[PDB]
Design a protein around this ligand. Sequence first.
Ligand SMILES: Cc1ncsc1CCOP(=O)(O)O
Ligand SMILES: C=C1C=NC(C)=NC1=N
Ligand SMILES: [Mg+2]
Length: 226
Amino acid sequence: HGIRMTRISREMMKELLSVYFIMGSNNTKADPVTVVQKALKGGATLYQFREKGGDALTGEARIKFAEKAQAACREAGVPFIVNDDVELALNLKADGIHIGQEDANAKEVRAAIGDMILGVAAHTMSEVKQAEEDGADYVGLGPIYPTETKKDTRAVQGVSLIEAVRRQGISIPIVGIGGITIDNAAPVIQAGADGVSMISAISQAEDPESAARKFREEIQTYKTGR
Ligand SMILES: Cc1ncsc1CCOP(=O)(O)O
Ligand SMILES: C=C1C=NC(C)=NC1=N
Ligand SMILES: [Mg+2]
């Protein structure tokens, strides 16, 4: 994955969303970069650098951690997506940026990043359609299930929005997020999602590599079966 000179295709974007690992240093008790490396080795298809909050690294320390995580992704041949930080994404030549509703304006971000991958968090039909109109390459829908990893969370919606979006004929790449585990991932794909994203199921697993591998196998099976 080099410098993109064209918008990513729907097909490729959907493949990348399969097992979307998201992590910051405060999401694990182990060595951060090591966990990322293990998740990639196990089979994560996309990684999002999400380092924020009172327990996260800041300044130069955060930037250096970002560089190492990006290096790990490059070694695994997996794209590196930055959460919220547009400047960081541009400075590191990340493969993409993921933003939320409270964040900035998707239209503005799309203009600033050229043909880089753009993900937008959406919780309602209106937000999903607006994200598509603004030029997002994918939307993250959730919380699907209960989760404490992110406290300022919206109401749990199961796979309701995913189904609604598909029923309306919207084909934008979708990834589910929120309390997803190997045990409850299948229904997310069955509802019409193109993959699952998670933090704790992998970051806090006693065996992150095996957890990621189990996810990879499960998701592939269900994509073929739907
Ligand atoms: C970042 C985020 N956004 C909505 S729910 C959530 C947390 C995902 O963490 P976990 O996979 O551990 O529930
Ligand atoms: C809120 C989010 C929604 N979707 C994804 C993929 N990541 C997030 N951090
Ligand atoms: Mg955000």
